[PDB]
Amino acid sequence: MVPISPIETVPVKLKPGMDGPKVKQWPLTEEKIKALVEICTEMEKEGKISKIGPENPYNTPVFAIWRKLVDFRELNKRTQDFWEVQLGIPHPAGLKKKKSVTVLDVGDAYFSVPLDEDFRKYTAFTIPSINNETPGIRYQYNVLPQGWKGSPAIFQSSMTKILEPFAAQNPDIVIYQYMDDLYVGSDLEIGQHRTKIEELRQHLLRWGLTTPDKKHQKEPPFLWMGYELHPDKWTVQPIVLPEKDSWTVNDIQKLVGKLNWASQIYPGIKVRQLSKLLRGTKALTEVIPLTEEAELELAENREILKEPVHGVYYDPSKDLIAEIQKQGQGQWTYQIYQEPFKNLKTGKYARMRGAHTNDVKQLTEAVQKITTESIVIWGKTPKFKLPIQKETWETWWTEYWQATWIPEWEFVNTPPLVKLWYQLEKEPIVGAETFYVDGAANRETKLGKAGYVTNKGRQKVVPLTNTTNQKTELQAIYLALQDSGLEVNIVTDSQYALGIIQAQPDKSESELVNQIIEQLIKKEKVYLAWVPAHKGIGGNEQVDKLV
Amino acid sequence: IETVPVKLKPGMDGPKVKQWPLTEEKIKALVEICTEMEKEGKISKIGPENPYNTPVFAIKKKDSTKWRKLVDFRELNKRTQDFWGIPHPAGLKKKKSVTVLDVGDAYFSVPLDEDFRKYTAFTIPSINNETPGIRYQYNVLPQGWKGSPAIFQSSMTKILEPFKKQNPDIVIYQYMDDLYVGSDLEIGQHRTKIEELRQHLLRWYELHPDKWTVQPIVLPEKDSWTVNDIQKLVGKLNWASQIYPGIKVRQLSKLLRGTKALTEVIPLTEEAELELAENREILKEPVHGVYYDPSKDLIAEIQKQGQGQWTYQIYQEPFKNLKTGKYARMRGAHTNDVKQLTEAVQKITTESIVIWGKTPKFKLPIQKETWETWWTEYWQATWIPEWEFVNTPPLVKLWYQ
């Protein structure tokens, strides 16, 4: 007998202050009992489990569905925390084409790695006897039990330690571990590749690990995690979008998840009108109708999902390019590629929840997102193609009160172009009229007044119902913008209005702010000045609006 | 050569902080560095029974192309028990010059308490989550940990004892992996003395605090004022009245009586000139009742002034500034605001280390996503301060300009 190499165990402990599980065994039918006796008999023959005496006080329930199933939920509650390196799956767009590719599953994954002997006594379970006239048969696990908290991490670390020397002495191949499968690829000739696969399964056999002996049961195309991997390209598995005249919240969540899934290769997917209906969630049963924007949106989603689109694999010798387009209503779409009309992948970005916003900020956020995704998938930042002129970005970042930055990028002239819609002056304007604005509201009656007095004697006070102080200050500024020429100086005391305008929005949720923006767009020059309130500053008339 | 037992604060488990993605060159650099350290016993590989993790990344310090390994021990530092204290040298900030030295390598000779090693675990990530990350834990005192200087204090004192007995006029302070050396010599004699100290540390950043002080509030001096000039002046004086008790603006607001054009020249009355003069005399004095409290946090606020100019204020109580300043240094960051902000954060943090011996909490004028995306690309210090993000444009911008 060729001596097998030992696999060193991983020391496992329970959570601090906790003890092993003590759960009562369930009553089973005589058929189920006989089945579990046969299964556990063959398992003990194979060495996976061992009979234990009555000294062990821990017990874990067992069921038969014949297949044996042990419910380790309590032991999982009582087992320590492990380090799982499976936090995010690899994206196919990050893979590099290989001439030959092979999938080797490891049969009896968790049942080939030994368990820490000091911990085995916590995995004890009992088989009930016929009519419960004899003591049930007691067993404990000698290997990693499937369903136990620590089996994936320990199995993965053991497999890594086994695979390290073979990968070291084979730099010309690539090996990936995932769950109960290994994926090996190489650009060698098919004969040499198959040879090195034989060497690999031999090296795994030296430790007592088995691979598919026949022709490897999985050949291209490979279906994996909603993906289709092909020899030359990749895509997503075909979509399944249900159609029903009565939609629920859970169905909206599944549809949103599926459309977001399809958006990673199909360019132009939009999910805003369907995601707006998820306001007031946690009630999975409901009937939510759809608007014309949502119906046309889903129809366009079926239109894009009509014909299949594929993505290519990554080539490190070529540059990495990401191009962004504005879609409207805070929606942005991007493509990552290396050669024209051959996308590595695609995606979308939706603006955050905010009261005010502009296109330049949203484009910046989309750039940051794409940068992080690119560093994840390819380990580098791509070069960007952005629909914004170099001068526009220059003016923006040079005048922005916050610090901002975009990595290396170039301008692509694909409308609609992101642009600055207005720019306030830095100094007062000579020859322009000076509008001193003010507004105020009564907290109880919600009655207010908004208006202005100017240096030319122009005046206005307008009374308002169902308003607030902030609303009357914005309204005052808006009145000055409506009744002034193409150049105007405006004096206010509203720290609120100045806070809104100094953030430079081009779109808002407040109709008053949007009307102010529309007025600013039509102006040649606007100088907005601020003064303290109630300081006896002549011109600024708090008493004119407090009547 | 003898390990000192180290524990955690009661009721606190080890750190479990996610490792953020790294570029391929940073991953390769960390692979090489960590391999070399493993061959030297400073770190050892760990198994899946260690659930703890601390972020790691790679930088390049000044005047060096060699990649350096930086561990974000912030969570572990605040989860590590308080080690006790040496009073901060109040004369280090008063000295003419201070040089900062990187004494981090000296930590790697002292072994780390075994039972604590599982808390310093870190992960070298992989691109695209292809292979599992390379997990390590420290065997010796790690750089960036707060217990490393606390444990090495006795050894460090024994090393510098001859030098301290030689030059009593040289102040020596220690913070994390850095040694601050203050003196009053000449730049040449300073550099030669620094070489003497570094070879003294071998066989076992010019910074002049005198050229930085505190900055007063100044008002314009004009022969003719416009309505806009007086409006801005009244705004600034009203703001400064939150800091100084006796500021009054009624005689200057009296000039604005009426709805005049903003560019119209207004002559100052005698009462207005008197009020402005009294406000000047008030502003020339220091602030009333401003004290430092070692039990409170230090807050730093940074305003972007444009054209590579930046203002900052370190305080504890609002309007009770302990330090103010204006970083306007230009060093290859002309086209990058984030690089400028990051260098400014580093300089302000260094000043804060010199004055009070601890770092302030920053309020950064930047969106969280931009900063979190780019700040490690320009970081060169071994420590890391705490920061938050101001999203509303403050009005007191030009009032600090």
Ligand SMILES: Cc1c(Oc2ccccc2OCCn2ccc(=O)[nH]c2=O)cc(CC2CC2)c2ccc(C#N)cc12
């Ligand atoms: C064979 C295989 C994977 O194969 C590879 C293994 C090693 C290196 C590159 C590989 O693929 C590069 C891209 N590619 C992909 C498929 C193909 O035919 N040809 C090709 O050049 C890589 C992953 C990526 C993930 C593991 C990291 C897989 C995932 C799932 C399945 C299945 N079933 C098989 C996988």
